[PDB]
Design a protein around this ligand. Structure first.
Ligand SMILES: *c1ccc([N+](=O)[O-])cc1C(=O)Nc1ccc(C#N)nc1
Lengths: 268, 14
C-alpha cells in the first residue's frame, strides 16, 4: 500500500462519513460503552434481572392491536421512526446517493434500516444484557431469555450476534463506513439501476478496507470478518417474518407484564 | 408497516 492521491481521497471520504455520522446519530458506540463499563458518573442505570427488580424499577420505565406481541412490534416500529429518519439523513451525506434513482433510494433504505438498527443495538449490548430507556436501565440477557414463549426467544439471537460483532472491537469511525456499505447494497430486490449503486459501494469498500488496516493492526482479515457479519444481520431480519407465524400459531398464555411490554418496545 | 416505512423514508428524503 502507498499514500497516493487515491488513498488521500479515501481518507477524506472516511472523515466526511464520520463527521456526518456524528451529526446524525446522537447515540454513538463510545457513549454506550462508557455507560456499560461504568465510566459515566452521570447516568448509572438500574439493573432489571428478575420479576422482583422489574417491579422495583417501575419508577424508571416511563410509559392499536390486541395481541401483545403485535402491539410490541407496532410500538417499537413506531419508536424506531427517529432512527429511520437519522439513517435516511445520514444516507444523504453519502456522495452520489441523492443522484441515484429516487425509487432505488427508497428501496436501499427500506431494506437497510433494519440491518443498521441491529448494528447499533449491538453497541447497547454486552454478554450480560442491553441498555434500555435511554441508558437509564439495564435489562439482563438471561431474564429476557427466561420469559414465557414466544417472548423468551425474541432477543437471544440478537445477543448472540452482538457478542460476536462486538468482539471485532469496531469504533464509531469504523461503523460509519460499515453503515454506508450496508446502504449501498446492490443485491436488494426491486433495484432499477444496480450499476451506479455498486460503483458507489466499490468506493465505500475501498475506504472501509483502508480504514480497517489503519485502525486495527492486530486483526487479520478484519475486512472479511466484518463483511461476513452482514450475513448474520440479514438472517436476523429475515427471521422476524418467521417470528410472526409462531405468534399466530401459539394458543397458550400470551400475556406479559405491562412493564415488560414497554421494555420490548424499546428494542427491535 | 412496509408502505408506512416507505412513506417515512420518502418524507425524510424530501
Ligand atoms: C420490536 C420490539 C421488540 C422486538 N423483539 O423483541 O424482537 C422486535 C421488534 C420489531 O418490530 N422487530 C422488527 C421489525 C421489522 C423488521 C424487519 N424487516 N425486523 C425486526
Amino acid at each position: 500500500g502507498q499514500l497516493n492521491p487515491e488513498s488521500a481521497d479515501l481518507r477524506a471520504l472516511a472523515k466526511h462519513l464520520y463527521d456526518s455520522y456524528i451529526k446524525s446519530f446522537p447515540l454513538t458506540k463510545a457513549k454506550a460503552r462508557a455507560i456499560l463499563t461504568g465510566k459515566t458518573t452521570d447516568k448509572s442505570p438500574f439493573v432489571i434481572y428478575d420479576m422482583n427488580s422489574l417491579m422495583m424499577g417501575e419508577d424508571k420505565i416511563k410509559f392499536q392491536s390486541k395481541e401483545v406481541a403485535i402491539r410490541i412490534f407496532q410500538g417499537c416500529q413506531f419508536r424506531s421512526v427517529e432512527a429511520v429518519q437519522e439513517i435516511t439523513e445520514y444516507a444523504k451525506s453519502i456522495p452520489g446517493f441523492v443522484n441515484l434513482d429516487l425509487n432505488d433510494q427508497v428501496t436501499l433504505l427500506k431494506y437497510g434500516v433494519h440491518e443498521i438498527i441491529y448494528t447499533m443495538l449491538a453497541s447497547l449490548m454486552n454478554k450480560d444484557g442491553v441498555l434500555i430507556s435511554e441508558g437509564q436501565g439495564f435489562m439482563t440477557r438471561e431474564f429476557l431469555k427466561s420469559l414465557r414463549k414466544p417472548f423468551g426467544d425474541f432477543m437471544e439471537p440478537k445477543f448472540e450476534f452482538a457478542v460476536k460483532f462486538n468482539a471485532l472491537e469496531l469504533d464509531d469511525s469504523d461503523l460509519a463506513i460499515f453503515i454506508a456499505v450496508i446502504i449501498l447494497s446492490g443485491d436488494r430486490p426491486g433495484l432499477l439501476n444496480v450499476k451506479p449503486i455498486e460503483d458507489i459501494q466499490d468506493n465505500l469498500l475501498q475506504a472501509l478496507e483502508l480504514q480497517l488496516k489503519l485502525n486495527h493492526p492486530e486483526s487479520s482479515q478484519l475486512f472479511a470478518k466484518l463483511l461476513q457479519k452482514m450475513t448474520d444481520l440479514r438472517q436476523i431480519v429475515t427471521e422476524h417474518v418467521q417470528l410472526l407465524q409462531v405468534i399466530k400459531k401459539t394458543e397458550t398464555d400470551m400475556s406479559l407484564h405491562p412493564l415488560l411490554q414497554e421494555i420490548y418496545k424499546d428494542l427491535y | 408497516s412496509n408502505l408506512g416505512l416507505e412513506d417515512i423514508i420518502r418524507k425524510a428524503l424530501m
